[PDB]
């Protein structure tokens, strides 16, 4: 079990495609699940995601034209109950206490939010929180130095290992953060 976490592509509103090295890494037959925070914002990016894995979950972003996407989603992958939401409904944006408030509502071990366009991955109150950032490194009015980034989760029984992939200049650089369920 390994999950791909990404979102906020904003194609074609703010970008046109993923960076060249991201399209090389993301190829079919290798990832089981994909959880998308939203803002694709069209079928051209949806159909590209459906060919990367069979089970793809997408929530609705603030600029997605498809209403059929739900506002939020709670899905289980192994032992971890995971909640998915774009994060434009979380006021204030990127606020810690407002995110933990939603973790109580969904009753999830891991919560996924994405509006910030800033990668974050950390444990709080013995609960884990992911923000993959903009995989395209799209424009954001509140942050000027966006690093194109996504997240790969390696779930095994009662342990998750999250890999952050970042395009720093031309290179793709990876860091690793691990979380074990209490």
């Amino acid at each position: 079990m390994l999950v791909l976490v990404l979102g906020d592509l904003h194609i074609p509103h703010r970008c046109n495609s993923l960076p060249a090295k991201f399209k090389k890494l993301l190829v079919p037959g290798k990832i089981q699940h994909i959880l998308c925070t939203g803002n694709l914002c069209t079928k051209e990016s949806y159909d590209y995601l459906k060919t990367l894995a069979g089970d793809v979950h997408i929530v609705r972003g603030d600029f997605d034209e498809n209403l059929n996407y739900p506002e939020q989603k709670v899905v289980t992958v192994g032992q971890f109950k995971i909640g998915l939401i774009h994060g434009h409904q979380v006021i204030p944006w990127g606020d810690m206490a407002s995110l933990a408030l939603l973790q109580r509502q969904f009753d999830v071990d891991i919560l996924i939010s994405g509006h910030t366009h800033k990668f974050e991955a950390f444990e709080h109150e013995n609960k884990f929180y992911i923000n993959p950032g903009s995989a395209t490194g799209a424009y954001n009015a509140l942050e000027t130095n966006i690093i194109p980034s996504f997240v790969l989760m390696d779930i095994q029984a009662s342990t998750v290992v999250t890999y952050v992939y970042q395009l720093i200049g031309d290179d793709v650089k990876v860091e690793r953060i691990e979380y074990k369920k209490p």
Partner: peptide, 6 residues
């Protein structure tokens, strides 16, 4: 060592 790392 990420699982991709191409």
């Amino acid at each position: 060592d990420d699982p991709l790392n191409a």
